[PDB]
Amino acid sequence: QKKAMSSRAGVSQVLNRYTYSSTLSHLRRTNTPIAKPRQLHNTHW
Amino acid sequence: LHKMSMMAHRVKVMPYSTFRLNLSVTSPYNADFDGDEMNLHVPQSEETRAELSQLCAVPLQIVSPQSNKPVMGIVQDTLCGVRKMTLRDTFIEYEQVMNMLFWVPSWDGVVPQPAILKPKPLWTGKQLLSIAIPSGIHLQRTDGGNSLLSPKDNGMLIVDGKVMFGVVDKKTVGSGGGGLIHTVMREKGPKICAELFGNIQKVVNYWLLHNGFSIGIGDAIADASTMKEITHAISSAKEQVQEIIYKAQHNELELKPGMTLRESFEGEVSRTLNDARDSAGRSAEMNLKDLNNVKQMVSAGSKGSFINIAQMSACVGQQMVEGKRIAFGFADRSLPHFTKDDFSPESKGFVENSYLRLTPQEFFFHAMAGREGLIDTAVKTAETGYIQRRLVK
Amino acid sequence: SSALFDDIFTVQTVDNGRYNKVSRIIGISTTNSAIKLTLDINNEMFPVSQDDSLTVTLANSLSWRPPKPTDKSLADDYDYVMFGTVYKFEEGDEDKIKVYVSFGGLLMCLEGGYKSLASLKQDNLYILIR
Amino acid sequence: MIIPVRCFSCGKVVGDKWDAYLRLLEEGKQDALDELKLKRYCCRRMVLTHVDLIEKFLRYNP
Amino acid sequence: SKEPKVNIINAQDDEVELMLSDVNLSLANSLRRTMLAEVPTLAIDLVEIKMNTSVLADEFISHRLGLIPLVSEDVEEMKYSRDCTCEDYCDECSVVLELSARHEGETTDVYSSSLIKVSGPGNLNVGEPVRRDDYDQGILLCKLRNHQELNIRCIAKKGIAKEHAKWSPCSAIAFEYDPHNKLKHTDFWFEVDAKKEWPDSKYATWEEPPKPGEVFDYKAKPNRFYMTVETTGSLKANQVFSRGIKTLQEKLANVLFELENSRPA
Amino acid sequence: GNLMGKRVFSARTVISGDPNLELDQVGVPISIAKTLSYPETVTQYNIHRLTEYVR
Amino acid sequence: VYGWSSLVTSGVIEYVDGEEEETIMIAMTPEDLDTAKRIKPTFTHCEIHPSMILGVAASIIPFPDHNQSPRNTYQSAMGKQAMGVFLTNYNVRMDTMANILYYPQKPLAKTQAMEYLKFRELP
Amino acid sequence: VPQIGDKFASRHGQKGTIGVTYRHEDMPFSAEGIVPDLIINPHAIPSRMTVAHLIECLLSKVGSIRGYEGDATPFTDLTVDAVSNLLRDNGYQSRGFEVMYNGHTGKKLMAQVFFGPTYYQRLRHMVDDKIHARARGPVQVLTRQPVEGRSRD
Amino acid sequence: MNAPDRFELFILPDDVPKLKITPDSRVPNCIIIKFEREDHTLANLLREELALYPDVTFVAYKVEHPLFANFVMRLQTEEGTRPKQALERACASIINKLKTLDHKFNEEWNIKN
Ligand SMILES: [Zn+2]
């Protein structure tokens, strides 16, 4: 907390509850702190 | 980003919770109805209003100064149908030729002498559609084999404000240069032309309401033998690749000045698959009769093009990122499902299949290709806006 | 209130270039060997095959009233009567002329040279056939 | 989430037909729709697609 | 007997196939929709829930009952709450119903059969939970568990399909004409052969085939229409046709009546 | 943020086109018209109508 | 008594990370490896099933192998915005905003994968 | 309740909102009686390219009639040529298309239509949660300009 | 929220006649009849039976816009013959056609088992 906002916001959110397939999706999610990375690499298969 | 992104409209209070705008005034704001929202502002002084109606009225805006041509034409249904209604084959009988004249508000109250009297007294779209065109409107065209008796019924000729010959579509009623609109604006004025839309509309939309129109998988299937004739235009195209690959894996080819021996290898593979794909589709294009709905929606000029048909009935195409066919992210291979050093097309991302029919590999590459697409549509989106902003300030 | 043309031709051929209900036919005249004829037509209302003996007419005469004229004039002593307008007046070399007639969507061409005082340049025009 | 009285599409009643159907399955081991008198797919889809949640809801206490 | 004519084909209690000839399509169609939308019926309209422990919400059940089919035989000898001089409602224009459901049988079901008719029917066929179910409890309103209760009170009223779908007694109606496209009111889609690829209709047997040698008949008009009038109950399949034929008429009437009221002045 | 552009007698909702509206019209939901006003000075040409609109 | 733990304790299936992947050869269709179907073109492993390269989202999309990929990517998002049933206990939940479609309906067409997405019971 | 503006969509990026709402009479129909619940435009197909959409319909029009669950699952052994044959066994055109009579006049439609049951998700985002209009409302403090957001007027 | 009350599709509102007839200036002997709270069901039916009185020179009808249940009918007849009448007649011919129908459908029915 403190005078340390030099952290990362996003970790831990408000679980979706619009639909079932919504919630599943939300849990199986990944992030990535910030033209090449956004690509769908081969390794992604 | 337009002088036209904001226009003054006549207010019409209506029920139901939504701003109801005309179709032809669609492309200026560039909206669609998939959820899009619109802002509305209300003048407040007696002049404020005037300033809004004398310079920002939608009718004054019809001819865009940026490209010295109109910027609002007839879209979708109205366009698509206006085409049908025009063909020599399109005939309408009294009962309807009447309910059609009624829908034109300016109608002089005079039914035009039937284009046919002999057995049954009929009329043709070309005739009635014309009751919408004001007197003094002279339009001349000429497409391909077009000559004062347009065989394929090409070109367009309207004299005294009556369609003489040719079919009417995007070319004759679009936000184009020769545009019957561009002309009616110039010849009659903001007002007259602005009304012209609604009419050409009202008649056509109504007509279509009754003639109906649709599309279904059936519009995307190719002739029994054509689907074969293509397959083997990919097989042969496959070997014209295996061939130049053998002839490369032997050093039996010279380096086209300025290019690497390798680069020059691609340069051909690419130019081989492309020309293959190009006719693959072209076989089906001419294989879709003058009844294929998808074709119809393409000629009218109201949606999609050759390319589209192709990727749906023939071959999807070659996938690509950064300009080169699917890379080797995995040391010397496309996917782990491949043998190393496979430079072939089935590995580098060539989807030989049609949407009507992709194989995992094809399906994947294809994704990697589209993925690049989505990328800039999500980047060039605001950097373009900056460059815009600068020019302004 | 007079006639402006009368002549029997012979169908040289019938063309249906992608038209399920209309055919553009052509045929030469039986009198002069200068008069040709090009005409679009409703194959559905009035069928026609190659080699037919048709009599073509024109002229202006007998809002648009429905029937009721059962007890009225009937300059319809034929089996096909279209109304339309003619647009261009072309000269094909020599002193041979050829007027172009469009019937609210149906094109037509005539050729020869002897209606130098018969075929006018007006919109009026009724085609007749039997 | 219970059975839908009358089919959206055409209108024919269909409330009663639930138990008849869910029965001609368990026992008569069966087409069911066809005999239940559900002709055109509009009403057909009605029954053949219902997922009776009410059952699970009912499994709750007070 | 006279003008247009009927020729009923196999007819039952929940259907009425028949051929309507010697009429203009225009007029057939008109009657078509009239059945679909403007025949007076009787449906629950107001629901006064008192207690409800069901897993379904108030207005969810409320909806349900709006759809439950009620009797509507002598529906014509009742008045629209809007014309009746009674503040709100009464026997002379409405049918009140009761519904009590206590969970006792340790899954208890609520069928439309469980409705009482608390108001005075005045001795006229109406306000009855149309049951066609095999056992005798048509339309499962809803289920409930252990001690869940549920007390309602319904009020039914006249009304039509325009006002709401919960009214129209029609519910699907077949309509076809000239199975052999002779009138050419259609352009068949096809890949090679229209005729082989496009299903021939069971209706093609009461009209003569095409016959190649014949040119295209033009002066011919849309005569004869093969239909089928399904019913949901409330009104007998036969009436759902008669009454239709008649309401359309009553309307055509006032158009002539309203006319008269405008000549005096 | 506040000077070269500010939030401003304005409304916004969802669009859907209508094929029976003159090119230049724009159907506004009753709701909205009953919310947005317009200061019209009283004048012996519109007094009559205004005194009605007011009642 | 024959789980997935046994399918692994018998060397019939392996857990391949992205790195190890590099040095193996994977066969698509276990079996194989008509003028209608899509034209199909050392092995160490085979693919449980290609339709497993998809995640929750696409798994509900019918014939995702027949649409323009960029579209599938969209539906991949709108799904997280449709209505249905997010739980059954919902009637005992005090959460701000929640929507239940009056009458659900499992689709007339489905993915074999839906079976694990309890989709048929929560359309 | 669904209203003339609320948004919907299938499972193919085929999103769209309501423009109007007609009833059974006004609606176009097929001899059987069957009438559409939804009428989307043929124009949302050509450039969207989403064809599977077209397929789910066909397949689902069979699964409708057959009672058997229709598999749409990814890379399997099911084809458009196959389903079409299954649909011909039941009675309707092998491609879906059906004859329809214009709900206003009863006269047949010169054309045929791709009439068939398709799944549609009712995305959240209904008009009445967005419709907003203001004329001199709560003014901000520091600035004195209006205030932000439709929720705070 | 902004949608009318259903009952506005058939009930005339505060002082409103089913019919309002206006003379047409565009051409001689012509009229435009505004029908309130009505549709194709009744419109097209009236439109139709008028191209039957070969004494009627013109007859088309239309629905201005779908939100509002109204419709305009334009009629024009021969010399010294008032269209309003032709509207009556063609309107009466309609009821008879249906009167017959009702009947022919009732005797027909009874003969069913
Ligand atoms: Zn149904």
Ligand SMILES: [Zn+2]
């Ligand atoms: Zn009362």
